[PDB]
Amino acid sequence: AAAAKPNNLSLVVHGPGDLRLENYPIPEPGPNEVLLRMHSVGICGSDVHYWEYGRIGNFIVKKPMVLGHEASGTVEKVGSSVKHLKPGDRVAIEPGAPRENDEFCKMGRYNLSPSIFFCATPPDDGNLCRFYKHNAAFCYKLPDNVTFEEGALIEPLSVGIHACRRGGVTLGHKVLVCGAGPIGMVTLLVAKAMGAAQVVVTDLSATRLSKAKEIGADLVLQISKESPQEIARKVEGQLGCKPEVTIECTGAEASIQAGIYATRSGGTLVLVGLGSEMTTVPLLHAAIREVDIKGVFRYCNTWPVAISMLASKSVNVKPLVTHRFPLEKALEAFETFKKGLGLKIMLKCDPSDQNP
Amino acid sequence: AAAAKPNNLSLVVHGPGDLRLENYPIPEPGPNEVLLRMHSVGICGSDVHYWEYGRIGNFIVKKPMVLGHEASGTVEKVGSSVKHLKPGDRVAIEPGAPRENDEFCKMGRYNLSPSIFFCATPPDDGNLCRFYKHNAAFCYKLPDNVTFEEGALIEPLSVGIHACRRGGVTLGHKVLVCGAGPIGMVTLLVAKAMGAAQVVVTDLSATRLSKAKEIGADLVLQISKESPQEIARKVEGQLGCKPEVTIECTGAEASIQAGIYATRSGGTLVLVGLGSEMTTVPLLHAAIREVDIKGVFRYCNTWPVAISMLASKSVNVKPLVTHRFPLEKALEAFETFKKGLGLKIMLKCDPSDQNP
Amino acid sequence: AAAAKPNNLSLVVHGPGDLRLENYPIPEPGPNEVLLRMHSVGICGSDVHYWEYGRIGNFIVKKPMVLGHEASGTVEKVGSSVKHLKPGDRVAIEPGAPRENDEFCKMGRYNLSPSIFFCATPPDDGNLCRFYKHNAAFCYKLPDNVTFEEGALIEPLSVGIHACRRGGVTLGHKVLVCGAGPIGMVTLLVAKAMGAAQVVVTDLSATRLSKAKEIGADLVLQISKESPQEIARKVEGQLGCKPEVTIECTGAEASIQAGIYATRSGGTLVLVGLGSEMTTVPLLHAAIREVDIKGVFRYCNTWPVAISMLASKSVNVKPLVTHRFPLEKALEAFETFKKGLGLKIMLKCDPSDQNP
Amino acid sequence: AAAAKPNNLSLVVHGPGDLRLENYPIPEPGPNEVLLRMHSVGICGSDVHYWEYGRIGNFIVKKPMVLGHEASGTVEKVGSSVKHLKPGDRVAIEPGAPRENDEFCKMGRYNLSPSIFFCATPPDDGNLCRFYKHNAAFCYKLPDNVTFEEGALIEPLSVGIHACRRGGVTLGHKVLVCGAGPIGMVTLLVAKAMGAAQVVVTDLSATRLSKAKEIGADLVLQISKESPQEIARKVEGQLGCKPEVTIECTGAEASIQAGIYATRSGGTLVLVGLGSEMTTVPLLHAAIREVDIKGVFRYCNTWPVAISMLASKSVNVKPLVTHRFPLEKALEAFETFKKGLGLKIMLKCDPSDQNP
Ligand SMILES: [Zn+2]
Ligand SMILES: [Zn+2]
Ligand SMILES: [Zn+2]
Ligand SMILES: [Zn+2]
């Protein structure tokens, strides 16, 4: 008989609480695509949320969907039109690839393209599996001194890069980060790398703040039941001034309100967290002091920069990885994520190499 | 006996509903100030509001305050250090003058300076009187082909200039302006002067919209009881697309919500109207499509630009003046403003010249 | 016998002074391309230059090349993947279409993409012919109230739009335009549309300046043998101040030098003309007054905006068309261009419709 | 007899090669000025050049001028209107203080103000003396953990901050710095602090490059007689790509040419060095790839940011000081500067404290 064919075991969400490991066909790359032997894939709240509620806002799972969107792997095969990538190349994968060159792509903000393909956001299948095909322009070669897990960490790191950019974070800035979860952490890492003089991070958990301290947070503030004004007051009390930029990573109404009150006049409040459809905020306060309120939707043009920072050892994201499981233990990985302990959980999809 | 001294009759608000015409001492200009013989002064909701409620937000009249802040006049005397102005110069007066060169002034956003002096905003006396002294750097010479009233209109025009600038209005844009009151009208004139392809104005009053058409509105939409989503749909229906910029001039929650829904992704929603301390809005919607929410606080660096536009006949604000009264008929002018009929009302403070 | 097949008569440059009208095969559109029945094509110095010297700098004609790059036409057929365009649509054609989604395209500056395809720039064939295929994303639908010739004029107009953008031209600006040739003219049109208060245009020809006056130039200055300093002096003498932006459209060294001397501190000097490989300029002068020197290479993201301006009658480019010949009289059209009289010469490729 | 009066020994340049130490009257601070007891003052090519040639470009010493402009000191007395400073405050002095609030100051670019006062640039006296008065808004309080010498180093550091800002240096960038002199070194430190992934420094001296390595240069390239094109090739060869930003610090024509050839398309070439009045450069090359050429004139809005960076230990400029002499040994200090050996030389003006 013929030799055994390769498999494409995949982690699939069928509905709320219905997670399964099942085999999928092996993708065939189009002329401008590459087939990747998946290596490392980190998971975040969006994967867990789809698993728990089968949806996130209007993005709802209407049919079985493969999870995973923060990954790296090895090029297995390339399409006829691919020139910059060859079999064997280690690459980082940017999950958002435009389907059409609309005005948003031409102006340089492809992340806003309405018909964009995005891994693990229904109805687009993610990459928590063995073999995955992706647009070649959105697969970036990893330098030899950058690990697969670092390559996978580029996705969450890019959320922080995009956020700091939109906020205008720069040399000597005093930056406030609301939330010490993984989003706030990468945001902290980026702010410092961009030259922020002081970064103050707030959170409900003293443990998370302790970890924030470990990776660079200049100041931490544990929040309990203080009002938004009191929070802003305490923040300013610690800095000796008002932060020029605030990056809200919790999505909670009270925190958003605190950011408006805390941010220096002419500064920027970036909203990265996702909360309710409606939020009650002191717009009048913001307008009078020209505190801009800018939202963030994923990212654009961050991979090459993230790779340069990692290759030059300008940032250290490794401490963010707290657990790693082989793809086959995906369910245990998700149950672990739910326990709220840790920061970034990594899934190892390549049986031939389970290392970082 | 000696010759009669000049007088300095002033319109003063002593408290809610307490408006009086009384004589004030004649100001003496310091080294970097000039004394102006007031000529034309337009009034707006702010003056009228301080009269009715004795306050606007946290800005409250604690002692009698002279009203007026949109003016022009003639230089009567100059301080020992003034060199760009001499007696007889016709000038436009920018009401906001910084008291100290703090970081806001140095960075170029002096309007945000915390200790800024501003005419007719408690506790700073306005210029609805005969003689007024002001910082010479904030008094701009008017070209011969620009009238005193045009000079006075620079103040309200600058609100529109600052708003369109913050919104990023530029060549070819489709702009939505919520509110056809005087603020919306100047915003309309400025947007067109900046190259906007089409400006659509909304309002509750059919009469105000008709006037909007008269000065350049490409499209108008009268609003009754439609929902924010409906408003957004109607606007897009008329433009054939979503406007890149929305300038909200009413301050109403419903209108602000319509702006978020209507604005094109990656676009900007400018908040010029002043409403409630709190506003319930769909921030999530705005964040997902990166629709920025920028507030505005008066203006900075608009006088020279305004003068060049008027001097070159690039914009015409004359149609905005619907009534003019001599200073002595100030009460009648304020009663007229309440009638809600009309656009801009001008007060003439110089008895020797009541002309435009 | 079968019915007669359509022809694809094309204007081809074989070498210096070797211009021919010959039949080409009829292009077949790929999945993301459209086939256009060419209608109107304007010609400029680059077409004439390739004809005269068979090259422009390093861009050299190594094999017969079809000329033409400023055009519009009617969609004849669409590729399998085209959704936004159907047979019969009248469209404007943007000649520069990227071959790969490199970092320049992702950042929003696709014009800088190294491997970009560009009509009539060797070795890419242009569109002065009957049928031409082009990337569908770069073919824009023309509104009914916009003529084919206006659609073709979008290309040269876009040179002006891009130039004013890079220069930062905005409301109330005083702008200097060196050169009253067709480039300077569209630049003049754009500057005014963006809100420039005064535009001063210089040139060696009094006739060209007279035409500039006809289309909006606020001030004109005929240049003879004056030195760069004297030019700057005269320019400032006319404006009463220094222009915040200078757009050099001749490429001549002396003019570039005058622009540096004339431009206001902190302003911008945009280089649109093409001269020698080397230029001697007073960089020290520019640096001390922070006068930025920015080059321009064609354009990016201008078509939709140009179309909006034309459809709303915000700009009038029609006066630029001074002559029109059918494709078959292409040689006469080129000999006419060489006579230096006129501004824009239009070629009509569709025998069924030779109107504007 | 009465008590001995304090002295105000000053280092004065009377003409080419004529340097003297002589006593000056003690300044009396005006209402918005402060009198400083000078502590640390670093010197640079400008002071040394005024000494050797009695001029720099059009800036010429027409009467004896006190040298020095990179300093810090202690507040000895404050004007009747000063409120943010009191006797005893340790402060950093920003040498450039505007004499009038013109359009340049209002727009936020006060360094361009035509009538600005600037220490040690004829005809304005510098601060290499015992007592010096300055505008209070331009004297910044130093935190306790920042030394006087660090305060004095803010001046040269700000040249680098302004240069990197104008160049747009940001996260992940590959930056080329031409020249390893003190300007190139601070530029290097700032570029890294701003998040540049790799900074490559070029220079004629192998010794200066070794020092560059010591403070953070990722790569160094010694230049001998290669051509500009060759230099550009070598730089790219080492980076593996073209740098997005080039900061030219020598002022040499050949070097400026290399910068144009080396800089990535759409990138920026910042000219910090001062060379000849005229420079022959390949503008065409720069325009075709939209490589912007921006000059710089000192700085604006950098002191507060510099202080925050030093106070947070985000940058370390201490390694720049290679020698320190008391004011009285100024001649020896200037002779040492000519030796070309060393980086930054500090003069100690306060006899009661000669420490860093
Ligand atoms: Zn994620
Ligand atoms: Zn008003
Ligand atoms: Zn052309
Ligand atoms: Zn210096």
Side-chain angles (χ1 to χ4, degrees):
Chain A
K5 253 77 169 301
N7 73 86
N8 188 17
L9 188 69
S10 309
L11 182 67
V12 189
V13 56
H14 284 245
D18 193 345
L19 204 60
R20 311 179 197 181
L21 285 168
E22 41 196 357
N23 187 64
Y24 268 52
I26 293 177
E28 187 64 16
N32 292 76
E33 304 177 310
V34 296
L35 178 67
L36 297 325
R37 182 175 68 257
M38 299 306 297
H39 190 290
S40 298
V41 185
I43 59 176
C44 78
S46 72
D47 296 306
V48 177
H49 201 298
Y50 281 125
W51 161 49
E52 296 182 299
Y53 313 84
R55 63 182 294 176
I56 297 182
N58 295 312
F59 296 125
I60 100 90
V61 183
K62 300 172 178 178
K63 68 176 182 180
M65 176 189 79
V66 176
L67 298 176
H69 60 272
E70 317 181 331
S72 63
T74 308
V75 180
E76 188 79 10
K77 184 177 180 178
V78 300
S80 51
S81 303
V82 180
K83 310 176 185 178
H84 70 300
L85 296 172
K86 65 182 183 303
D89 288 335
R90 300 168 62 245
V91 298
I93 302 172
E94 181 170 356
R99 273 180 270 234
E100 57 182 301
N101 194 27
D102 55 31
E103 293 309 309
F104 296 106
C105 291
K106 296 182 192 168
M107 82 160 92
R109 301 182 70 172
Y110 61 80
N111 62 305
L112 303 180
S113 177
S115 59
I116 191 172
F117 167 90
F118 194 95
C119 299
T121 282
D124 304 315
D125 281 338
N127 54 206
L128 251 179
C129 56
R130 306 293 195 193
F131 300 88
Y132 174 74
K133 73 181 189 306
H134 201 66
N135 180 287
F138 288 87
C139 290
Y140 310 74
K141 190 184 304 180
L142 293 171
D144 292 358
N145 73 321
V146 179
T147 71
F148 282 107
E149 288 190 3
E150 282 181 297
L153 287 167
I154 290 176
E155 198 284 334
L157 182 62
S158 292
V159 170
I161 294 173
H162 188 60
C164 289
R165 281 183 177 173
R166 296 230 65 219
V169 169
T170 191
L171 190 65
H173 271 183
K174 303 300 176 59
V175 180
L176 163 62
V177 180
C178 307
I183 302 296
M185 293 299 88
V186 292
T187 293
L188 158 65
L189 287 177
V190 175
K192 296 265 60 182
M194 287 176 84
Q198 303 247 75
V199 174
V200 53
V201 180
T202 65
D203 198 271
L204 295 165
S205 169
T207 296
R208 302 219 294 186
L209 288 177
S210 182
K211 211 317 194 305
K213 256 292 188 58
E214 284 178 45
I215 63 174
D218 296 296
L219 296 150
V220 294
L221 189 63
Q222 176 164 30
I223 300 305
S224 61
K225 297 184 176 300
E226 304 94 316
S227 70
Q229 301 93 308
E230 289 173 359
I231 302 301
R233 200 187 316 303
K234 285 178 166 59
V235 172
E236 168 164 21
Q238 289 187 300
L239 291 169
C241 60
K242 304 169 73 69
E244 297 102 326
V245 180
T246 293
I247 302 173
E248 212 299 309
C249 305
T250 79
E253 179 177 291
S255 187
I256 295 172
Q257 288 192 35
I260 294 178
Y261 292 149
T263 307
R264 187 183 309 189
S265 299
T268 299
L269 166 58
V270 184
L271 304 183
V272 186
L274 301 305
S276 311
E277 286 180 55
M278 297 294 277
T279 310
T280 294
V281 294
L283 290 180
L284 179 56
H285 188 80
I288 286 182
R289 298 197 299 107
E290 273 172 29
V291 169
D292 297 324
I293 299 175
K294 299 183 177 181
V296 110
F297 182 60
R298 310 207 274 225
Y299 38 61
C300 63
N301 301 300
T302 56
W303 262 252
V305 159
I307 288 177
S308 291
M309 288 293 87
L310 289 175
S312 67
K313 309 301 171 182
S314 297
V315 68
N316 178 34
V317 300
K318 289 176 184 177
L320 299 179
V321 179
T322 55
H323 319 72
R324 62 174 58 79
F325 307 78
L327 173 62
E328 294 87 337
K329 293 190 68 173
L331 278 71
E332 290 88 332
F334 277 67
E335 298 285 43
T336 290
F337 181 100
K338 199 168 65 177
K339 295 301 169 59
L341 166 57
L343 240 39
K344 180 61 60 183
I345 299 175
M346 280 288 158
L347 283 169
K348 318 296 294 189
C349 306
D350 195 330
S352 78
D353 177 21
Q354 298 276 292
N355 291 144
Chain B
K5 253 74 173 298
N7 73 82
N8 187 21
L9 187 71
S10 313
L11 182 68
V12 188
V13 51
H14 284 239
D18 190 349
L19 198 61
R20 311 176 198 184
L21 282 166
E22 41 197 346
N23 186 68
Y24 265 53
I26 299 175
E28 181 66 6
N32 306 91
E33 305 178 313
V34 291
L35 177 64
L36 302 319
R37 182 172 72 253
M38 299 306 301
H39 190 288
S40 301
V41 184
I43 50 175
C44 78
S46 74
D47 302 298
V48 174
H49 199 297
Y50 281 127
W51 161 49
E52 298 182 300
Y53 312 79
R55 67 181 295 171
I56 297 182
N58 294 308
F59 292 124
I60 104 92
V61 181
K62 299 175 184 175
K63 71 162 192 171
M65 175 183 79
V66 177
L67 293 175
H69 62 275
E70 314 180 347
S72 70
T74 310
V75 179
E76 182 87 5
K77 180 178 178 178
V78 302
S80 60
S81 301
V82 177
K83 302 183 179 183
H84 66 297
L85 299 177
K86 67 184 184 301
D89 287 343
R90 298 170 61 247
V91 302
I93 301 162
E94 181 166 1
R99 269 181 278 239
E100 62 180 301
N101 192 28
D102 54 27
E103 321 307 4
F104 291 105
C105 294
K106 296 180 187 169
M107 76 164 94
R109 302 184 68 175
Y110 63 77
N111 62 305
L112 303 182
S113 176
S115 57
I116 193 169
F117 165 98
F118 195 95
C119 302
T121 287
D124 305 319
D125 285 328
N127 53 208
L128 247 181
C129 55
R130 306 291 194 198
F131 299 91
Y132 175 76
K133 78 178 184 303
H134 202 67
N135 180 282
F138 287 85
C139 291
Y140 308 76
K141 193 182 300 177
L142 292 174
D144 290 354
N145 68 330
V146 174
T147 70
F148 281 107
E149 287 189 359
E150 280 178 299
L153 288 167
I154 293 173
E155 202 284 339
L157 180 59
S158 298
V159 174
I161 295 182
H162 192 59
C164 286
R165 278 181 177 174
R166 297 230 65 214
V169 171
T170 193
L171 190 61
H173 274 179
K174 302 297 165 61
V175 180
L176 163 63
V177 178
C178 307
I183 295 304
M185 295 300 85
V186 296
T187 292
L188 161 64
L189 293 179
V190 171
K192 295 259 58 181
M194 291 188 79
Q198 299 216 86
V199 178
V200 51
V201 181
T202 64
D203 198 88
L204 297 169
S205 165
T207 297
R208 304 215 291 178
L209 292 182
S210 180
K211 209 301 182 295
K213 263 290 187 60
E214 288 180 45
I215 68 170
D218 296 295
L219 301 158
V220 292
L221 185 67
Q222 177 170 43
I223 303 304
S224 59
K225 295 183 175 304
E226 298 93 324
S227 70
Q229 305 84 311
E230 300 169 12
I231 302 304
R233 281 199 292 288
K234 281 187 169 60
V235 174
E236 167 161 32
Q238 287 197 57
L239 287 172
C241 59
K242 300 170 79 75
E244 298 98 321
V245 180
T246 289
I247 302 183
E248 210 299 305
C249 307
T250 72
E253 175 173 297
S255 188
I256 294 173
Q257 289 191 47
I260 292 173
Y261 292 145
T263 305
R264 189 179 301 185
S265 297
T268 298
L269 166 58
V270 183
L271 306 184
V272 186
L274 295 301
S276 300
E277 259 197 63
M278 299 291 273
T279 309
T280 298
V281 288
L283 287 182
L284 173 56
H285 184 91
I288 288 181
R289 303 194 299 103
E290 279 175 20
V291 167
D292 296 334
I293 297 173
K294 300 183 178 179
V296 45
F297 186 56
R298 309 197 280 224
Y299 37 62
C300 64
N301 300 298
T302 61
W303 261 253
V305 159
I307 288 174
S308 299
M309 295 287 74
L310 295 167
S312 60
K313 310 300 165 177
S314 301
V315 58
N316 176 41
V317 297
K318 284 172 180 170
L320 300 175
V321 179
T322 59
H323 307 66
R324 57 172 60 76
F325 305 82
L327 176 60
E328 297 90 332
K329 295 187 72 175
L331 278 74
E332 291 83 343
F334 278 63
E335 294 290 52
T336 294
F337 185 98
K338 293 183 67 174
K339 299 298 173 59
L341 183 60
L343 231 46
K344 179 60 59 176
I345 296 175
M346 284 286 172
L347 285 167
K348 318 295 293 185
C349 311
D350 190 336
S352 71
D353 173 26
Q354 297 282 291
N355 294 139
Chain C
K5 253 77 169 301
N7 73 86
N8 188 17
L9 188 69
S10 309
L11 182 67
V12 189
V13 56
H14 284 245
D18 193 345
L19 204 60
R20 311 179 197 181
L21 285 168
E22 41 196 357
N23 187 64
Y24 268 52
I26 293 177
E28 187 64 16
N32 292 76
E33 304 177 310
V34 296
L35 178 67
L36 297 325
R37 182 175 68 257
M38 299 306 297
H39 190 290
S40 298
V41 185
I43 59 176
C44 78
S46 72
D47 296 306
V48 177
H49 201 298
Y50 281 125
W51 161 49
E52 296 182 299
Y53 313 84
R55 63 182 294 176
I56 297 182
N58 295 312
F59 296 125
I60 100 90
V61 183
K62 300 172 178 178
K63 68 176 182 180
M65 176 189 79
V66 176
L67 298 176
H69 60 272
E70 317 181 331
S72 63
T74 308
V75 180
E76 188 79 10
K77 184 177 180 178
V78 300
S80 51
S81 303
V82 180
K83 310 176 185 178
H84 70 300
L85 296 172
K86 65 182 183 303
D89 288 335
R90 300 168 62 245
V91 298
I93 302 172
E94 181 170 356
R99 273 180 270 234
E100 57 182 301
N101 194 27
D102 55 31
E103 293 309 309
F104 296 106
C105 291
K106 296 182 192 168
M107 82 160 92
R109 301 182 70 172
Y110 61 80
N111 62 305
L112 303 180
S113 177
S115 59
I116 191 172
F117 167 90
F118 194 95
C119 299
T121 282
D124 304 315
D125 281 338
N127 54 206
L128 251 179
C129 56
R130 306 293 195 193
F131 300 88
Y132 174 74
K133 73 181 189 306
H134 201 66
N135 180 287
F138 288 87
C139 290
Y140 310 74
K141 190 184 304 180
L142 293 171
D144 292 358
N145 73 321
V146 179
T147 71
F148 282 107
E149 288 190 3
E150 282 181 297
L153 287 167
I154 290 176
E155 198 284 334
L157 182 62
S158 292
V159 170
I161 294 173
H162 188 60
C164 289
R165 281 183 177 173
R166 296 230 65 219
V169 169
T170 191
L171 190 65
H173 271 183
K174 303 300 176 59
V175 180
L176 163 62
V177 180
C178 307
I183 302 296
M185 293 299 88
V186 292
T187 293
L188 158 65
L189 287 177
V190 175
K192 296 265 60 182
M194 287 176 84
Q198 303 247 75
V199 174
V200 53
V201 180
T202 65
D203 198 271
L204 295 165
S205 169
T207 296
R208 302 219 294 186
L209 288 177
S210 182
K211 211 317 194 305
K213 256 292 188 58
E214 284 178 45
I215 63 174
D218 296 296
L219 296 150
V220 294
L221 189 63
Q222 176 164 30
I223 300 305
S224 61
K225 297 184 176 300
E226 304 94 316
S227 70
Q229 301 93 308
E230 289 173 359
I231 302 301
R233 200 187 316 303
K234 285 178 166 59
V235 172
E236 168 164 21
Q238 289 187 300
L239 291 169
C241 60
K242 304 169 73 69
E244 297 102 326
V245 180
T246 293
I247 302 173
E248 212 299 309
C249 305
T250 79
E253 179 177 291
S255 187
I256 295 172
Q257 288 192 35
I260 294 178
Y261 292 149
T263 307
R264 187 183 309 189
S265 299
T268 299
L269 166 58
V270 184
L271 304 183
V272 186
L274 301 305
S276 311
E277 286 180 55
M278 297 294 277
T279 310
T280 294
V281 294
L283 290 180
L284 179 56
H285 188 80
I288 286 182
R289 298 197 299 107
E290 273 172 29
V291 169
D292 297 324
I293 299 175
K294 299 183 177 181
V296 110
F297 182 60
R298 310 207 274 225
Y299 38 61
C300 63
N301 301 300
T302 56
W303 262 252
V305 159
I307 288 177
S308 291
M309 288 293 87
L310 289 175
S312 67
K313 309 301 171 182
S314 297
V315 68
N316 178 34
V317 300
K318 289 176 184 177
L320 299 179
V321 179
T322 55
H323 319 72
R324 62 174 58 79
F325 307 78
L327 173 62
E328 294 87 337
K329 293 190 68 173
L331 278 71
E332 290 88 332
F334 277 67
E335 298 285 43
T336 290
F337 181 100
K338 199 168 65 177
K339 295 301 169 59
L341 166 57
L343 240 39
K344 180 61 60 183
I345 299 175
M346 280 288 158
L347 283 169
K348 318 296 294 189
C349 306
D350 195 330
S352 78
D353 177 21
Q354 298 276 292
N355 291 144
Chain D
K5 253 74 173 298
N7 73 82
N8 187 21
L9 187 71
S10 313
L11 182 68
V12 188
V13 51
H14 284 239
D18 190 349
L19 198 61
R20 311 176 198 184
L21 282 166
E22 41 197 346
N23 186 68
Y24 265 53
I26 299 175
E28 181 66 6
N32 306 91
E33 305 178 313
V34 291
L35 177 64
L36 302 319
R37 182 172 72 253
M38 299 306 301
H39 190 288
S40 301
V41 184
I43 50 175
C44 78
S46 74
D47 302 298
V48 174
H49 199 297
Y50 281 127
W51 161 49
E52 298 182 300
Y53 312 79
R55 67 181 295 171
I56 297 182
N58 294 308
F59 292 124
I60 104 92
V61 181
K62 299 175 184 175
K63 71 162 192 171
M65 175 183 79
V66 177
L67 293 175
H69 62 275
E70 314 180 347
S72 70
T74 310
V75 179
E76 182 87 5
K77 180 178 178 178
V78 302
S80 60
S81 301
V82 177
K83 302 183 179 183
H84 66 297
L85 299 177
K86 67 184 184 301
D89 287 343
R90 298 170 61 247
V91 302
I93 301 162
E94 181 166 1
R99 269 181 278 239
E100 62 180 301
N101 192 28
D102 54 27
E103 321 307 4
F104 291 105
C105 294
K106 296 180 187 169
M107 76 164 94
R109 302 184 68 175
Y110 63 77
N111 62 305
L112 303 182
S113 176
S115 57
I116 193 169
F117 165 98
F118 195 95
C119 302
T121 287
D124 305 319
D125 285 328
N127 53 208
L128 247 181
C129 55
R130 306 291 194 198
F131 299 91
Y132 175 76
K133 78 178 184 303
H134 202 67
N135 180 282
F138 287 85
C139 291
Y140 308 76
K141 193 182 300 177
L142 292 174
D144 290 354
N145 68 330
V146 174
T147 70
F148 281 107
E149 287 189 359
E150 280 178 299
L153 288 167
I154 293 173
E155 202 284 339
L157 180 59
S158 298
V159 174
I161 295 182
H162 192 59
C164 286
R165 278 181 177 174
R166 297 230 65 214
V169 171
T170 193
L171 190 61
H173 274 179
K174 302 297 165 61
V175 180
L176 163 63
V177 178
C178 307
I183 295 304
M185 295 300 85
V186 296
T187 292
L188 161 64
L189 293 179
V190 171
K192 295 259 58 181
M194 291 188 79
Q198 299 216 86
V199 178
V200 51
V201 181
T202 64
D203 198 88
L204 297 169
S205 165
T207 297
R208 304 215 291 178
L209 292 182
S210 180
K211 209 301 182 295
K213 263 290 187 60
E214 288 180 45
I215 68 170
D218 296 295
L219 301 158
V220 292
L221 185 67
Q222 177 170 43
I223 303 304
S224 59
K225 295 183 175 304
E226 298 93 324
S227 70
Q229 305 84 311
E230 300 169 12
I231 302 304
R233 281 199 292 288
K234 281 187 169 60
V235 174
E236 167 161 32
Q238 287 197 57
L239 287 172
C241 59
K242 300 170 79 75
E244 298 98 321
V245 180
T246 289
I247 302 183
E248 210 299 305
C249 307
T250 72
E253 175 173 297
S255 188
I256 294 173
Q257 289 191 47
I260 292 173
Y261 292 145
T263 305
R264 189 179 301 185
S265 297
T268 298
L269 166 58
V270 183
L271 306 184
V272 186
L274 295 301
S276 300
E277 259 197 63
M278 299 291 273
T279 309
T280 298
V281 288
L283 287 182
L284 173 56
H285 184 91
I288 288 181
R289 303 194 299 103
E290 279 175 20
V291 167
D292 296 334
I293 297 173
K294 300 183 178 179
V296 45
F297 186 56
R298 309 197 280 224
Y299 37 62
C300 64
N301 300 298
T302 61
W303 261 253
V305 159
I307 288 174
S308 299
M309 295 287 74
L310 295 167
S312 60
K313 310 300 165 177
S314 301
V315 58
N316 176 41
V317 297
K318 284 172 180 170
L320 300 175
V321 179
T322 59
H323 307 66
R324 57 172 60 76
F325 305 82
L327 176 60
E328 297 90 332
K329 295 187 72 175
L331 278 74
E332 291 83 343
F334 278 63
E335 294 290 52
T336 294
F337 185 98
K338 293 183 67 174
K339 299 298 173 59
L341 183 60
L343 231 46
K344 179 60 59 176
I345 296 175
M346 284 286 172
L347 285 167
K348 318 295 293 185
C349 311
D350 190 336
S352 71
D353 173 26
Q354 297 282 291
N355 294 139

